[PDB]
Design a protein around this ligand. Sequence first.
Ligand code: NA
Ligand code: NA
Length: 260
Amino acid sequence: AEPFAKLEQDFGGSIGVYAMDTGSGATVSYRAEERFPLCSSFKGFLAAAVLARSQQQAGLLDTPIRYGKNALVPWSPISEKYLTTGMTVAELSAAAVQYSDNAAANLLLKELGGPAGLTAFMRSIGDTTFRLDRWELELNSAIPGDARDTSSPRAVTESLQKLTLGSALAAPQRQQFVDWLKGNPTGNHRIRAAVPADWAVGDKTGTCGVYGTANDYAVVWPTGRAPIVLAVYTRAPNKDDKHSEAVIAAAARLALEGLG
Ligand code: NA
Ligand code: NA
């Protein structure tokens, strides 16, 4: 705990970390079973849920969604761009992962039966911690003590392992999920700043902002070695506290360094 504890004193909040080396089975854990707000990080699992549904509902991914302007939400750069023409379920899924597109996330949540439907998918793969309760943008409130729209670093990492490396998704769906996670058009740092430059990274960030709340999870492939899965989540006690990308990167470095 000691290096992580010092880091969270410099941050002024709480940090939760879980990392697993899928080769050795080694793990690093700090506050890994505490709850933290998901923020936009749920959008990675949302896309995985859509891919899983496609296995039982062939034709889903190519379905055109001709949404109206009322479906749009602040920070929906792709769905706003294509408002006049519409987008397929697959295109909305790519936008939700790669651009954190909020309207795309709400439209896809509708396809799955809402936040409860996404939560049920996570339960179906063995994740009993994840809960999504609200839609964009309400889910980002990050109020201290509120368990709505939260998970734990350990549950996030374990679920990400199952979906990107395990057999929770069929291999073609799995490869699509990985490919979406590897796209980095918003140019995020965080875990990407912690890994060696030759490692491949599939990541999804979250930035509630309020209460210094921000996070990142990733599957990372060291060249020629077994992949590592990790999650770093933060929150802070005061509404006005600023999140820190540098703290997330620093905690991710410690996690990678702490593995055996
Ligand atoms: Na350790
Ligand atoms: Na590589």
